[PDB]
């Protein structure tokens, strides 16, 4: 089938001048030996497959990227809507998964999960219809709303979702909307030609903004809503793999880190998880 | 209209489904894709690449390069053990952070043979012979060469070619093992001993070092995608 792992051909005893157990890693060449070259083996028909380790199967799983909150009633208009500059560096799990590769190119499937609640205080609603939320995506350059009740929410060309509670989470598909021929997870360079300004990948990040608000005016009480954004990469292509990260993440715009140990300690070089008394192995 | 009927699983969001969805940007003109070298199609292309294994990961050595060096000395070393560790590619302080263990940590089930390449980084006039043994489970770990010769062993003679490969085969009662290893899916022990000893001429340094690399064979497989227990955060990064 596709793509079944290799079989172990039967091998017997031998006494030859062609030794494949000895190699030279100084050439940057990983040895392509198999168990049959160092011992006698049997013929097994291996039906195992590598279908679940492919890139399209490794990355096509929705993961949270942002959690935002916004109020519905009033007070400090900045609190009546939420905004987000699109990243993949705010949640560590998908960030590391993406950072396994230097370059990526994929279509996206975006899901929005909005959960509301009732805020405490005096003058509660005691009865209210369902809440309708609006999510509007502004490409780089367009006007950005300054309040829940603002003219910028018409979205004559900006795509938007009007979503009512009690339904399935909102969802769409987005093509490969980058400027270059692939998404650059890393960038060893600057923004200006004089080598100053912004260093790292932050300069190439020009994706846009997402704003979310309550369509309802309410006016009898306060209700707080939380929006969670989920990203599913499909049709994924990846180039130039990298080692996985060791240090915990610190910033969402840098690769800054603190020096961490390579692994976890163990008692001795001959430690095999036993009590290990003293003599000829432990002194 | 057409009479339908809604079944369980309606209006749910399962994070591992395959459904179509409308495009927010109709008729978008995607920029052409070019040829970029080094394309990955499968993660096992990465686990099949040699990576240096920190066998000497004691308390002091984890914070230096000394974790990667296995020391060898040229006296009467017939009763000393060069190194020894459990065979646990996913859950073991020696293997869990290498280019192989990192890949296995995003999966719960693994199965296959594993290559361990040992490289002698001594002088060109230093010669020796070592015994690299693998012992399947069911008995206590070997305590000496006389006990460790009874397993799958290779006798490595250091000479003009510097690297020797020990291939840990697949011997288990189950098709797959668990990355989070237990007492029921144990995989044995890997040990090293002096066959004859390290001998140097007058002038060469008397102590040498060995480096260890680990990769996967062409019959290694992983399944059951999970989260890795290596990265975590307290609050949203800003």
């Amino acid at each position: 089938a596709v793509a079944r792992v290799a079989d172990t051909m039967p091998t017997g005893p031998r006494n030859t001048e062609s030794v494949p157990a000895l190699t030279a890693v100084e050439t940057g060449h990983t040895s392509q030996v198999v168990p049959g070259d160092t011992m006698q083996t049997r013929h097994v028909k291996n039906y195992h497959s590598r279908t679940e380790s492919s890139i399209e199967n490794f990355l096509c799983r929705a993961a949270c990227v942002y959690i935002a909150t916004y109020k519905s009633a009033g007070g400090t208009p900045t609190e009546r809507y939420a905004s987000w500059r699109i990243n993949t560096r705010q949640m560590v799990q998908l960030r590391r998964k993406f950072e396994l590769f230097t370059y990526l190119r994929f279509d996206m499937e975006i899901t929005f999960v909005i959960t509301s609640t009732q805020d405490p205080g005096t003058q509660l609603a005691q009865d209210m219809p369902v809440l309708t939320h609006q999510i509007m995506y502004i490409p780089p350059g367009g006007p950005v709303p300054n309040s829940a009740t603002d003219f910028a929410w018409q979205s004559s060309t900006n795509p938007s979702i009007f979503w009512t509670e009690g339904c399935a989470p909102a969802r769409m598909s987005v093509p490969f909307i980058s400027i270059g021929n692939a998404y650059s997870n890393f960038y060893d360079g600057w923004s200006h030609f004089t080598q100053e300004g912004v260093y790292g990948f932050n300069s190439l990040n020009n994706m846009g903004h997402i704003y979310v608000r309550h369509v309802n005016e309410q006016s009898l009480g306060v209700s707080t809503s939380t929006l969670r954004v989920y990203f599913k990469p499909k049709h994924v292509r990846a180039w130039v793999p990298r080692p996985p990260r060791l240090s915990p993440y610190v910033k969402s715009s840098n690769v800054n880190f603190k020096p961490t140990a390579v692994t976890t300690e163990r008692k001795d070089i001959n430690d095999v998880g036993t009590l290990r008394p003293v003599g000829y192995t432990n002194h | 209209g057409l009479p339908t009927m809604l079944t369980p699983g309606s209006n749910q969001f399962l994070t591992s489904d395959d459904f179509q969805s409308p495009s927010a940007m109709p008729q978008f003109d995607v920029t052409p894709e070019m040829k970029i070298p080094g394309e990955v199609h499968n993660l096992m292309e990465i686990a099949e690449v040699d990576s240096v294994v920190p066998v000497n990961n004691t308390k002091e050595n984890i914070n230096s390069m000394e974790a990667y060096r296995i020391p060898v000395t040229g006296g009467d070393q017939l009763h000393t053990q060069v190194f020894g560790f459990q065979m646990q590619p996913g859950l073991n302080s020696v293997f869990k952070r290498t280019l192989l263990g990192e890949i296995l940590n995003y999966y719960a089930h693994w199965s296959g043979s594993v290559k361990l390449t040992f490289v002698f980084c001594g002088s060109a006039m230093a010669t020796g012979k070592f015994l690299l043994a693998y012992s399947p489970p069911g008995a206590s770990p070997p305590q000496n060469r006389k006990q460790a010769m009874l397993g799958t062993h290779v006798i490595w003679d250091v000479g003009l070619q510097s690297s020797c490969v020990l291939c840990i085969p697949w011997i288990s009662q189950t098709h797959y093992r668990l990355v989070q290893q237990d007492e029921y899916t144990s995989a044995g022990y890997v040990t090293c001993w002096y066959q004859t000893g390290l001998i140097v001429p007058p002038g060469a340094p008397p102590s040498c070092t060995i480096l260890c690399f680990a990769s996967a064979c062409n019959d290694f497989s992983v399944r059951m995608l999970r989260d890795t227990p290596f990265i975590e955060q307290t609050q949203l990064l800003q």
Partner: antibody, heavy 117, light 114 residues
Framework: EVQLQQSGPELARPWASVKISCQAF???????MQWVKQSPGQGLEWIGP????????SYNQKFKGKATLTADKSSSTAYMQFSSLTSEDSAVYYC???????????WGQGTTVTVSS | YIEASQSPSSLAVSVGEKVTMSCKSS????????????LAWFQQKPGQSPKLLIY???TRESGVPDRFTGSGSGTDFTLTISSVKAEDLAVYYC?????????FGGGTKLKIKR
């Protein structure tokens, strides 16, 4: 045969850390030897091993920093380095040797210290 | 610091009878690989150096009479004597050599009751 002749009396004032010494009648490769502190007011305790044929040395946690060991291959004699000699350090220090991986095959006579000033 | 303590402090058993000393540890001293119990029994009289009597907690040092017999395993060890002599007044120590640091037993005196 393998009698471990120790040093003579070393009674002195405190802060005069004495190097207690022992001799041996066996080859100094692939064996070990230890010093154990004996005072009838403290029972028995242990200080640290020196392991010829392996070139390594440990110490008791209560005596960490307090004591140090070293030996000479071509001298057939091993002595102790001591630090911050006190009045309570009065004990009949011994010497013991290891023929096997462990256990004490032989014992020394026992040299006592009388820290008085 | 593993403690191989002893009980009781003394027995004052009379000459011509049996005696059974005991030694209890805080952690097992049996190596499941080579099947050995890491305990030794030592004899100490006031004035001279102590002498090893039993090694591996079940085998007797050469030059020692048959009166001493070691037994026990795991954590708990015993030393049985069938007929003691009045010259055996001493404090016997159950010394462990399993790990670091080496810790000797609490001893057991021999008083005068005849």
């Amino acid at each position: 045969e393998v009698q471990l002749q120790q040093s003579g009396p070393e009674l002195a004032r405190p802060w005069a850390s004495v190097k207690i010494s022992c001799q041996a009648f066996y080859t100094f490769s692939n064996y070990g030897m230890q010093w154990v502190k004996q005072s009838p007011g403290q029972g028995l305790e242990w200080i640290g091993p020196f392991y010829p044929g392996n070139a390594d040395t440990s110490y008791n946690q209560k005596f960490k920093g307090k004591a140090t060991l070293t030996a000479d291959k071509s001298s057939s004699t091993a002595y102790m380095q001591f630090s911050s000699l006190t009045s309570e350090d009065s004990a009949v220090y011994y010497c013991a040797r290891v023929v096997a991986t462990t256990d004490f095959d032989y014992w020394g006579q026992g040299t006592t210290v009388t820290v008085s000033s | 610091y593993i403690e191989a303590s002893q009980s009781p402090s003394s027995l004052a058993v009379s000459v011509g009878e049996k005696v059974t000393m005991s030694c209890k540890s805080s952690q097992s001293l049996l190596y499941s690989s080579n099947q050995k119990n890491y305990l030794a029994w030592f004899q100490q009289k006031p004035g001279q150096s102590p002498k090893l009597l039993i090694y591996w907690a079940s085998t007797r040092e050469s030059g020692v009479p048959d009166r001493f017999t070691g037994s026990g395993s795991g954590t708990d060890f015993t030393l049985t004597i069938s007929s003691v002599k009045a010259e055996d007044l001493a404090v016997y120590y159950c010394q462990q050599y399993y790990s670091y640091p080496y810790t000797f037993g609490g001893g057991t005196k021999l008083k005068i009751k005849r």
